[PDB]
Nucleic acid binder design. Structure first.
Ligand SMILES: [Ca+2]
Length: 258
DNA sequence: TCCAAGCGCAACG
DNA sequence: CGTGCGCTGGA
């Protein structure tokens, strides 16, 4: 299954097992806002597939000072583990200043990355994680390292897309015309008997992406921003202590009962 | 309303 | 197993 199906899988399990107290609906925040436990002791439940990513922050190379600057537009504050990562990269500036999409791994102790993850998810009121190895596994953030292996890389991650809008619509119709695509527009929705799912076309400094949705195509404008972020990858352990697992399930059952 | 950017997510070649 | 689109301040 994909990660969206996985998250629904997790929510359904929580509600059927522990009562209909776990919400996954409405808008999300610019930070992690996954599953919400809606009881008297509320907290957010972060769902992770066995191979996932797990937080990030953008660093800007300062080639005059040979150090990395924390982006003022980042959405989490510098903690000591942020600082240890930045310090390591800055002391090794020439090794990290040539940005790449393949990334460069950061060889600090794994506990630095685990502690960053703990600090970040705690700050977003994420108190528990849920994952699955065939059985559901629920555990508190303070015990993260008993469940996931963690690594850390610095890589270019292109920013995301945005919806086609009215201002861009003439440009997009002209891009379809130039590419020879047969089409009709219903507002901002695209209709075509051609097979153009995942088609990429460009026009007037905009890269467009076409995606099939129900009975029409939805059109996106891709980003032109290619900044680099420290970003954490996690892999579910194959050797999880059943003792820690059991006490952590009780910790969850306590949290939802307070 | 619109755009650049950062964070969401494992996805995918 | 070694890359980026969908969504969400400030002008
Ligand atoms: Ca990594």
């Amino acid at each position: 299954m994909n990660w969206k199906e996985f998250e629904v899988f997790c929510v359904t399990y929580l509600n059927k097992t522990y009562g209909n107290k776990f919400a996954k609906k409405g808008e999300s925040d610019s930070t992690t806002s996954d599953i919400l436990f809606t009881g008297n002791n509320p907290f957010y439940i972060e769902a992770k597939m066995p191979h996932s990513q797990c937080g990030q922050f953008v660093l800007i190379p300062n080639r005059a000072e040979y150090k990395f600057d924390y982006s003022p537009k980042n959405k989490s504050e510098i903690n000591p583990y942020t600082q240890k990562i930045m310090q390591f990269m800055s002391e090794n500036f020439s090794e990290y200043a040539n940005l790449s999409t393949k990334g460069k791994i950061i060889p600090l102790p794994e506990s630095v990355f685990v502690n960053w993850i703990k600090e970040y998810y705690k700050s977003k009121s994420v108190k528990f994680f849920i994952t699955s190895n065939g059985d559901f596994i629920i555990f508190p953030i303070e015990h993260f390292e008993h469940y996931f292996n963690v690594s850390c890389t610095y890589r270019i991650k292109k920013s995301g897309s945005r919806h086609l809008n009215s201002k861009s619509l003439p440009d997009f119709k002209q891009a379809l015309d130039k590419k020879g695509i047969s089409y009709t527009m219903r507002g901002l929705e695209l209709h075509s008997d051609e097979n153009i799912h995942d088609k990429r076309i460009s026009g007037d400094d905009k890269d467009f992406l076409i995606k099939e949705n129900n009975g029409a195509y939805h059109v996106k404008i891709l980003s032109n921003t290619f900044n680099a972020n420290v970003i954490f990858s996690i892999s579910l352990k194959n050797n999880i202590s059943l003792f820690i697992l059991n006490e952590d399930r009780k910790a969850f059952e306590a949290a939802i009962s307070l």
